[PDB]
Protein backbone atom coordinates (compact mmCIF):
# COMPACT_ATOMS: atom_id res chain seq x y z
CA UNK A 1 0.00 0.00 0.00
CA UNK A 2 1.17 3.49 -1.00
CA UNK A 3 0.75 7.12 -0.01
CA UNK A 4 1.15 9.43 -2.99
CA UNK A 5 1.27 13.23 -3.23
CA UNK A 6 -0.90 14.88 -5.93
CA UNK A 7 -0.18 18.42 -7.12
CA UNK A 8 -1.67 20.84 -9.66
CA UNK A 9 1.23 23.29 -9.47
CA UNK A 10 4.21 21.66 -7.74
CA UNK A 11 3.74 23.82 -4.62
CA UNK A 12 0.54 22.68 -2.90
CA UNK A 13 -0.04 18.94 -2.35
CA UNK A 14 -2.75 16.59 -1.27
CA UNK A 15 -2.06 13.10 0.03
CA UNK A 16 -3.94 10.08 -1.19
CA UNK A 17 -3.67 6.48 -0.05
CA UNK A 18 -3.56 3.84 -2.77
CA UNK A 19 -4.73 0.47 -1.47
CA UNK A 20 -3.21 -2.60 -3.25
CA UNK A 21 -6.26 -2.91 -5.55
CA UNK A 22 -6.80 0.70 -6.68
CA UNK A 23 -5.91 2.30 -10.02
CA UNK A 24 -4.87 5.75 -11.27
CA UNK A 25 -7.98 6.41 -13.35
CA UNK A 26 -9.68 7.84 -10.28
CA UNK A 27 -7.40 10.89 -10.41
CA UNK A 28 -8.02 11.66 -14.05
CA UNK A 29 -4.79 12.03 -15.97
CA UNK A 30 -1.55 11.95 -13.94
CA UNK A 31 2.08 12.66 -14.84
CA UNK A 32 5.34 11.63 -13.16
CA UNK A 33 8.79 13.25 -13.19
CA UNK A 34 11.87 11.53 -14.74
CA UNK A 35 10.05 8.19 -15.13
CA UNK A 36 7.25 6.70 -17.12
CA UNK A 37 4.05 5.77 -15.35
CA UNK A 38 1.29 3.73 -16.99
CA UNK A 39 -0.39 2.09 -14.00
CA UNK A 40 -0.36 2.16 -10.18
CA UNK A 41 2.28 -0.59 -10.40
CA UNK A 42 4.71 2.03 -11.74
CA UNK A 43 4.18 4.40 -8.80
CA UNK A 44 6.22 4.12 -5.59
CA UNK A 45 5.22 4.93 -1.99
CA UNK A 46 5.64 8.69 -1.33
CA UNK A 47 5.90 9.50 -5.05
CA UNK A 48 4.75 12.90 -6.34
CA UNK A 49 2.26 12.88 -9.23
CA UNK A 50 1.32 15.95 -11.28
CA UNK A 51 -2.14 16.68 -12.70
CA UNK A 52 -3.30 19.24 -15.31
CA UNK A 53 -4.85 22.50 -14.15
CA UNK A 54 -7.24 25.15 -15.45
CA UNK A 55 -6.71 27.41 -12.43
CA UNK A 56 -5.98 30.90 -13.79
CA UNK A 57 -3.51 31.79 -11.02
CA UNK A 58 -1.40 28.66 -11.62
CA UNK A 59 -1.44 29.14 -15.40
CA UNK A 60 -0.51 32.79 -15.05
CA UNK A 61 2.24 31.78 -12.62
CA UNK A 62 3.65 29.39 -15.24
CA UNK A 63 2.97 31.77 -18.12
CA UNK A 64 1.32 28.92 -20.06
CA UNK A 65 -2.27 28.33 -21.18
CA UNK A 66 -3.99 25.07 -20.22
CA UNK A 67 -2.86 23.26 -23.38
CA UNK A 68 0.81 24.27 -23.08
CA UNK A 69 0.66 23.34 -19.40
CA UNK A 70 -0.38 19.81 -20.42
CA UNK A 71 2.64 19.63 -22.75
CA UNK A 72 4.82 20.89 -19.85
CA UNK A 73 3.57 18.02 -17.64
CA UNK A 74 4.09 15.48 -20.44
CA UNK A 75 7.72 16.53 -20.80
CA UNK A 76 8.39 16.14 -17.04
CA UNK A 77 8.75 12.38 -17.67
CA UNK A 78 11.96 13.03 -19.61
CA UNK A 79 15.32 12.55 -17.94
CA UNK A 80 18.16 14.77 -19.19
CA UNK A 81 21.82 14.99 -18.27
CA UNK A 82 23.62 18.28 -17.73
CA UNK A 83 27.30 18.37 -18.65
CA UNK A 84 29.91 21.00 -17.84
CA UNK A 85 32.10 22.83 -20.36
CA UNK A 86 34.43 24.89 -18.26
CA UNK A 87 32.03 27.09 -16.31
CA UNK A 88 29.00 26.52 -18.61
CA UNK A 89 26.32 23.87 -18.21
CA UNK A 90 25.27 22.28 -21.49
CA UNK A 91 22.27 20.05 -22.11
CA UNK A 92 23.50 16.65 -23.19
CA UNK A 93 22.51 16.10 -26.80
CA UNK A 94 19.68 13.91 -27.95
CA UNK A 95 16.49 14.12 -29.99
CA UNK A 96 17.16 17.48 -31.69
CA UNK A 97 17.44 19.44 -28.44
CA UNK A 98 20.19 21.79 -29.64
CA UNK A 99 17.91 24.84 -29.90
CA UNK A 100 17.23 24.40 -26.17
CA UNK A 101 20.86 23.68 -25.30
CA UNK A 102 21.85 26.81 -27.21
CA UNK A 103 19.43 29.01 -25.27
CA UNK A 104 20.68 27.54 -22.00
CA UNK A 105 24.32 28.43 -22.78
CA UNK A 106 23.44 31.93 -24.00
CA UNK A 107 21.46 32.86 -20.89
CA UNK A 108 24.38 31.71 -18.72
CA UNK A 109 26.70 33.95 -20.75
CA UNK A 110 24.35 36.85 -20.02
CA UNK A 111 23.87 35.96 -16.33
CA UNK A 112 20.16 36.39 -16.92
CA UNK A 113 17.78 36.44 -13.95
CA UNK A 114 14.18 35.23 -14.12
CA UNK A 115 10.98 36.09 -12.31
CA UNK A 116 8.04 33.81 -11.49
CA UNK A 117 8.03 30.05 -12.05
CA UNK A 118 11.23 30.15 -14.11
CA UNK A 119 13.31 31.50 -11.20
CA UNK A 120 13.21 28.19 -9.39
CA UNK A 121 13.34 26.14 -12.61
CA UNK A 122 16.52 27.91 -13.73
CA UNK A 123 18.07 27.58 -10.26
CA UNK A 124 17.28 23.86 -10.37
CA UNK A 125 18.94 23.60 -13.81
CA UNK A 126 22.08 25.41 -12.62
CA UNK A 127 22.13 22.99 -9.65
CA UNK A 128 22.20 20.10 -12.13
CA UNK A 129 18.49 19.28 -12.61
CA UNK A 130 17.23 20.66 -15.95
CA UNK A 131 13.87 18.82 -15.87
CA UNK A 132 11.54 21.71 -15.04
CA UNK A 133 13.28 24.31 -17.22
CA UNK A 134 13.57 22.08 -20.28
CA UNK A 135 9.92 20.97 -19.97
CA UNK A 136 8.90 24.65 -19.87
CA UNK A 137 10.92 25.37 -23.01
CA UNK A 138 9.13 22.64 -25.02
CA UNK A 139 5.76 23.71 -23.65
CA UNK A 140 6.20 27.38 -24.59
CA UNK A 141 6.83 26.36 -28.22
CA UNK A 142 4.10 23.69 -28.26
CA UNK A 143 6.91 21.25 -29.08
CA UNK A 144 7.47 17.51 -28.53
CA UNK A 145 10.78 15.93 -27.57
CA UNK A 146 12.37 15.17 -30.94
CA UNK A 147 11.13 18.39 -32.55
CA UNK A 148 13.61 20.95 -33.80
CA UNK A 149 12.32 24.47 -33.20
CA UNK A 150 13.29 28.15 -33.58
CA UNK A 151 15.84 29.07 -30.86
CA UNK A 152 14.79 32.72 -31.26
CA UNK A 153 11.11 31.87 -30.65
CA UNK A 154 12.18 30.13 -27.42
CA UNK A 155 14.35 33.14 -26.38
CA UNK A 156 11.52 35.60 -27.03
CA UNK A 157 9.26 33.34 -24.88
CA UNK A 158 11.80 33.21 -22.02
CA UNK A 159 12.46 36.98 -22.28
CA UNK A 160 8.90 37.69 -21.12
CA UNK A 161 10.01 36.32 -17.74
CA UNK A 162 13.42 37.99 -17.48
CA UNK A 163 13.83 39.90 -14.25
CA UNK A 164 15.05 42.93 -16.19
CA UNK A 165 14.52 46.69 -15.81
CA UNK A 166 12.10 47.00 -18.74
CA UNK A 167 10.68 50.19 -17.34
CA UNK A 168 13.64 52.34 -18.38
CA UNK A 169 14.44 50.29 -21.48
CA UNK A 170 14.50 52.80 -24.28
CA UNK A 171 15.20 52.79 -28.02
CA UNK A 172 14.98 55.84 -30.30
CA UNK A 173 15.11 55.53 -34.07
CA UNK A 174 15.36 57.98 -36.96
CA UNK A 175 13.75 57.22 -40.30
CA UNK A 176 14.80 59.20 -43.40
CA UNK A 177 13.33 59.16 -46.93
CA UNK A 178 11.63 61.51 -49.40
CA UNK A 179 8.76 61.74 -46.91
CA UNK A 180 11.08 63.55 -44.54
CA UNK A 181 13.02 62.86 -41.37
CA UNK A 182 10.92 61.17 -38.70
CA UNK A 183 11.55 59.52 -35.34
CA UNK A 184 9.84 56.88 -33.23
CA UNK A 185 10.54 55.35 -29.82
CA UNK A 186 10.29 51.84 -28.46
CA UNK A 187 10.13 51.00 -24.77
CA UNK A 188 10.31 47.93 -22.58
CA UNK A 189 10.44 44.46 -24.02
CA UNK A 190 9.75 45.49 -27.63
CA UNK A 191 12.84 47.74 -27.44
CA UNK A 192 15.15 44.91 -26.26
CA UNK A 193 14.26 42.32 -28.88
CA UNK A 194 15.23 43.46 -32.36
CA UNK A 195 14.81 41.75 -35.73
CA UNK A 196 17.76 42.36 -38.10
CA UNK A 197 19.14 41.18 -41.46
CA UNK A 198 22.32 40.01 -39.72
CA UNK A 199 23.06 39.87 -36.01
CA UNK A 200 25.75 42.41 -35.19
CA UNK A 201 25.63 46.07 -34.07
CA UNK A 202 26.38 47.46 -37.56
CA UNK A 203 23.19 45.90 -38.93
CA UNK A 204 21.24 46.86 -35.82
CA UNK A 205 22.25 50.53 -35.97
CA UNK A 206 21.32 51.11 -39.62
CA UNK A 207 18.65 49.37 -41.65
CA UNK A 208 17.99 49.92 -45.33
CA UNK A 209 14.62 49.43 -46.94
CA UNK A 210 12.43 51.18 -49.47
CA UNK A 211 9.64 53.45 -48.27
CA UNK A 212 6.13 52.28 -49.27
CA UNK A 213 4.76 55.86 -49.25
CA UNK A 214 7.41 57.67 -51.32
CA UNK A 215 9.37 55.73 -53.90
CA UNK A 216 12.80 56.05 -52.39
CA UNK A 217 15.38 54.24 -50.30
CA UNK A 218 14.82 54.81 -46.63
CA UNK A 219 17.22 54.62 -43.74
CA UNK A 220 16.12 53.56 -40.26
CA UNK A 221 18.82 54.35 -37.67
CA UNK A 222 19.38 53.88 -33.98
CA UNK A 223 20.15 57.30 -32.49
CA UNK A 224 19.66 56.43 -28.85
CA UNK A 225 19.51 53.26 -26.75
CA UNK A 226 19.52 52.31 -23.09
CA UNK A 227 18.69 48.63 -22.64
CA UNK A 228 19.03 46.05 -19.84
CA UNK A 229 19.87 43.61 -22.64
CA UNK A 230 19.65 43.52 -26.42
CA UNK A 231 18.63 40.46 -28.44
CA UNK A 232 19.21 40.59 -32.19
CA UNK A 233 17.24 37.97 -34.20
CA UNK A 234 17.96 37.17 -37.85
CA UNK A 235 14.88 37.81 -40.04
CA UNK A 236 15.77 35.91 -43.20
CA UNK A 237 17.70 32.89 -41.96
CA UNK A 238 21.34 32.73 -40.87
CA UNK A 239 23.61 35.47 -42.23
CA UNK A 240 27.39 35.07 -42.24
CA UNK A 241 29.09 38.07 -40.63
CA UNK A 242 31.70 38.88 -37.98
CA UNK A 243 30.25 38.93 -34.47
CA UNK A 244 30.95 41.90 -32.19
CA UNK A 245 33.42 41.45 -29.38
CA UNK A 246 30.93 43.34 -27.21
CA UNK A 247 28.35 40.55 -27.47
CA UNK A 248 28.09 38.22 -24.47
CA UNK A 249 27.11 35.48 -26.90
CA UNK A 250 25.80 34.38 -30.29
CA UNK A 251 23.84 31.44 -31.76
CA UNK A 252 25.04 29.75 -34.94
CA UNK A 253 22.75 27.84 -37.31
CA UNK A 254 23.94 25.19 -39.77
CA UNK A 255 21.97 22.96 -42.13
CA UNK A 256 18.67 23.58 -43.88
CA UNK A 257 15.33 25.07 -42.85
CA UNK A 258 14.36 21.40 -42.43
CA UNK A 259 17.31 19.53 -40.88
CA UNK A 260 18.90 22.30 -38.81
CA UNK A 261 21.35 22.41 -35.91
CA UNK A 262 22.05 25.24 -33.39
CA UNK A 263 24.99 25.98 -31.18
CA UNK A 264 26.06 28.89 -29.00
CA UNK A 265 29.30 30.87 -28.95
CA UNK A 266 30.41 32.69 -25.81
CA UNK A 267 33.57 33.56 -23.81
CA UNK A 268 35.63 32.96 -26.96
CA UNK A 269 34.37 29.36 -27.16
CA UNK A 270 31.93 27.23 -29.17
CA UNK A 271 29.38 25.26 -27.13
CA UNK A 272 27.92 22.64 -29.47
CA UNK A 273 26.24 19.90 -27.41
CA UNK A 274 26.39 17.55 -30.39
CA UNK A 275 29.99 18.27 -31.48
CA UNK A 276 32.49 18.43 -28.60
CA UNK A 277 35.33 19.68 -30.76
CA UNK A 278 33.66 22.48 -32.68
CA UNK A 279 35.88 25.54 -32.87
CA UNK A 280 34.99 29.16 -32.26
CA UNK A 281 34.54 31.09 -35.52
CA UNK A 282 34.25 34.89 -35.38
CA UNK A 283 32.63 34.87 -38.80
CA UNK A 284 29.75 32.36 -38.72
CA UNK A 285 26.20 31.97 -40.03
CA UNK A 286 24.52 33.66 -37.05
CA UNK A 287 20.83 33.76 -36.19
CA UNK A 288 21.24 35.38 -32.73
CA UNK A 289 23.44 37.89 -30.89
CA UNK A 290 22.97 39.02 -27.28
CA UNK A 291 24.29 42.12 -25.50
CA UNK A 292 23.84 43.14 -21.86
CA UNK A 293 23.56 46.65 -20.40
CA UNK A 294 23.64 48.15 -23.86
CA UNK A 295 23.76 51.91 -24.27
CA UNK A 296 24.37 54.11 -27.28
CA UNK A 297 23.94 57.63 -28.63
CA UNK A 298 24.57 59.01 -32.13
CA UNK A 299 24.95 62.82 -32.38
CA UNK A 300 26.51 63.23 -35.88
CA UNK A 301 26.67 65.30 -38.07
ZN1 LIG B 1 9.02 57.94 -47.72
Swiss-Prot record:
Location relative to the cell: Host endoplasmic reticulum membrane; Host cytoplasm
UniProt note: domains: The hydrophobic region HD1 probably mediates the membrane association of the replication complex.
UniProt-recorded name of the protein: Papain-like protease
Peptidase C16 domain location: 60-301
Function: Responsible for the cleavages located at the N-terminus of the replicase polyprotein. In addition, PL-PRO possesses a deubiquitinating/deISGylating activity and processes both 'Lys-48'- and 'Lys-63'-linked polyubiquitin chains from cellular substrates.
Biological classification of the source: Viruses, Riboviria, Orthornavirae, Pisuviricota, Pisoniviricetes
Domain Ubiquitin-like, first and last residues per copy: 1-51
Organism of derivation: Avian infectious bronchitis virus (strain Beaudette)
Membrane topology field: Multi-pass membrane protein
Effect in UniProt of substituting residue 98 to S: Complete loss of PL-PRO activity
Cofactor(s) named in the record: Zn(2+)
Sequence positions that bind Zn(2+) 1: 177, 179, 211, 214
UniProt superkingdom: Viruses
Known catalytic reactions: Thiol-dependent hydrolysis of ester, thioester, amide, peptide and isopeptide bonds formed by the C-terminal Gly of ubiquitin (a 76-residue protein attached to proteins as an intracellular targeting signal)
Chain intervals annotated as zinc finger (C4-type): 177-214
Active site: 98 (for pl-pro activity), 261 (for pl-pro activity), 272 (for pl-pro activity)
Amino acid sequence: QKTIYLTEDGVKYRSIVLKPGDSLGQFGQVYAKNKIVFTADDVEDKEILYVPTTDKSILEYYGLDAQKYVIYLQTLAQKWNVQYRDNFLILEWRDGNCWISSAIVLLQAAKIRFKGFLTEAWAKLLGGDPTDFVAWCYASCTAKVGDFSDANWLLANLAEHFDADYTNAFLKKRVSCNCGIKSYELRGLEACIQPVRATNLLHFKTQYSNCPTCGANNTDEVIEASLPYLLLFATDGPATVDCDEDAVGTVVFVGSTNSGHCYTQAAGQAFDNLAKDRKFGKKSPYITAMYTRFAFKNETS
